[PDB]
From Swiss-Prot, chain A:
Family: Belongs to the UQCRQ/QCR8 family.
N6-acetyllysine modification, residue list: 32
Modification N6-succinyllysine occurs at: 32
Species annotation: Bos taurus
Gene name of the encoded protein: UQCRQ
Protein name as catalogued: Cytochrome b-c1 complex subunit 8
Swiss-Prot record, chain B:
Record's subcellular location: Mitochondrion inner membrane
Highest rank taxon of the organism: Eukaryota
Family assignment from sequence similarity: Belongs to the peptidase M16 family. UQCRC1/QCR1 subfamily.
Annotated TM spans: none
Source organism per UniProt: Bos taurus
Function: Component of the ubiquinol-cytochrome c oxidoreductase, a multisubunit transmembrane complex that is part of the mitochondrial electron transport chain which drives oxidative phosphorylation.
Assembly: Component of the ubiquinol-cytochrome c oxidoreductase (cytochrome b-c1 complex, complex III, CIII), a multisubunit enzyme composed of 11 subunits. The complex is composed of 3 respiratory subunits cytochrome b, cytochrome c1 and Rieske protein UQCRFS1, 2 core protein subunits UQCRC1/QCR1 and UQCRC2/QCR2, and 6 low-molecular weight protein subunits UQCRH/QCR6, UQCRB/QCR7, UQCRQ/QCR8, UQCR10/QCR9, UQCR11/QCR10 and subunit 9, the cleavage product of Rieske protein UQCRFS1.
Protein name: Cytochrome b-c1 complex subunit 1, mitochondrial
Modified residue annotations for N6-acetyllysine: 35
Length: 75, 89
């Protein structure tokens, strides 16, 4: 039930925009793009990766332990 | 010095027009023009005199958002042709 012209109050803010036909869709796509993804990765790796390596270690150990347990030796 | 440089470069005889309308003969308008304007570009026709160059129109938006003002102003335009063009009519 929310409409433009009724959302909120904003004062003293200028927005400059260009037409889509004046500008490139892929402005500096690799030159600026790659540096950004690396920066985004660095920012989040310590938050995202360590639970999944913790999954990976419990996976690797668990599969190994199950394999070894269904072998005998001195009996 | 900025101001006199502007005056020197721009207020030059081939670039200005003495216009009149009303109860006058053209002859006396011409007479007064030689009387009072003739010391302007008799040998002052010199320096880079002064080409305009085309202006690139864009296609773009400027939005000064001020909700403290009680009415919105909006102006919208496509690129027109210059003074010369028959398309104006």
């Amino acid at each position: 039930g929310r409409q433009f012209g009724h959302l909120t109050r904003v004062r003293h803010v200028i927005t400059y925009s260009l037409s889509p036909f004046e500008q490139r869709a892929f402005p500096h796509y690799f030159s600026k793009g790659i540096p950004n993804v690396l920066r985004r990765t660095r920012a989040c790796i310590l938050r995202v990766a360590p639970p999944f390596v913790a999954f990976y270690l419990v996976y690797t150990w668990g599969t190994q332990e199950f394999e070894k347990s269904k072998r005998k030796n001195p009996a | 010095a900025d101001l006199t440089e502007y005056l020197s470069r721009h207020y030059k005889a081939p670039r200005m027009v003495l216009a009149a309308a009303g109860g006058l003969e053209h002859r006396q308008l011409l007479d007064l023009a030689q009387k009072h304007f003739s010391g302007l570009s008799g040998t002052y026709d010199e320096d880079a005199v002064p080409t305009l160059s085309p202006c690139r129109f864009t296609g773009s938006q400027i939005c000064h958002r001020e909700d403290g003002l009680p009415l919105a102003h909006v102006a919208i335009a496509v690129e027109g042709p210059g003074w010369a063009h028959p398309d104006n009519v």
